[PDB]
Amino acid sequence: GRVRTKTVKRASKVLIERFYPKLTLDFETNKRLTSEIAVIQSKRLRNKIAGYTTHLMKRIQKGPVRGI
């Protein structure tokens, strides 16, 4: 399965509460932004965080999300 863990789920939604105006619906732009916003120890976790943030951004435009 592809269930994301808590280390990626909670860290991504902190970004939305903190940098929503600068975020977007594009993964490639979001991936570069989070490399200057967060100190990520490994490249794989950086893409994972941005990939779930993009899903949340895509979901916020369709209505209110729980936790943000």
Binding site: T7, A11, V14, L15, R18, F19, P21, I37, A38, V39, I40, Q41, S42, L45, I49
Partner: protein, 223 residues
């Protein structure tokens, strides 16, 4: 003589492994931590880290002089080809080797285990260790043997970071009734690491909001 590349790097490692155990047996009473072999042109620098650099360098440095001679005569080295330096460990509390040797010297003095065990739990943390766990196994007056763990603080267990931020030291303690086995696991704080990663892999540090400025409609500031 002529030694292959594969067999030369292994020989250097085997030489290190055998040399390291030699210091553990000889300088056990001085809290031996580790040895660093710094090869250089025309010299073989060896740096030993111990809690007490007086027992090695005693009575006009007689022991260290008589100790480097034991290595020239066993590895067929030129008398000038090796140089040994004794260096004090900066943070004695963060070295599990020093902490395990210190615990053994107390247990062999008849001191109670609880008083001895908590003496390294607080000494390790006082030096700034992120976490520490001590396991002591063996027999004490009772015929049956037991093991007791004394944890404190935060400890990591699985994956690569244990190879980066944790050093370990096991020694056997010779008691009148048997052998006591002690394990001293010390996890150093990753923020103070100066060579490897400076944080845990899943530590995410989000920057702060730089926003909440006031925007004015549309001027131009010239220079």
């Amino acid at each position: 003589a002529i030694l292959s590349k594969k067999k030369k790097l292994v020989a250097d490692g085997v030489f290190y492994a055998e040399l390291n155990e030699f210091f553990t047996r000889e300088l056990a009473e001085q809290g031996y931590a580790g040895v660093e072999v710094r090869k250089t042109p025309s010299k073989l620098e060896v740096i030993v880290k111990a809690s007490n650099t007086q027992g090695v360098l005693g009575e006009q440095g007689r022991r260290i002089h008589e100790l480097t001679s034991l290595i020239v005569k066993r590895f067929k080295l030129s008398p000038e080809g090796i140089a040994i330096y004794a260096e004090r460990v900066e943070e004695r509390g963060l070295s599990a080797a020093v902490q395990a040797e210190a615990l053994k010297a107390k247990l062999l003095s008849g001191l109670p285990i609880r008083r001895a065990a908590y003496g390294v739990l607080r000494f390790a943390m006082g030096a700034g260790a992120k976490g520490v766990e001590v396991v002591i196994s063996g027999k004490l007056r009772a015929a049956r043997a037991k093991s007791q763990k004394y944890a404190d603080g935060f400890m990591i267990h699985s994956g690569q970071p244990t190879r980066d931020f944790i050093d370990i030291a096991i020694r056997h303690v010779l008691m009148r009734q048997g052998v006591l086995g002690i394990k001293v696991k010390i996890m150093k704080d990753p923020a103070a690491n100066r060579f490897g990663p400076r944080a845990l892999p899943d530590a995410v540090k989000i920057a702060e909001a730089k926003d909440e400025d006031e925007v004015i409609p549309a001027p131009t500031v010239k220079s």
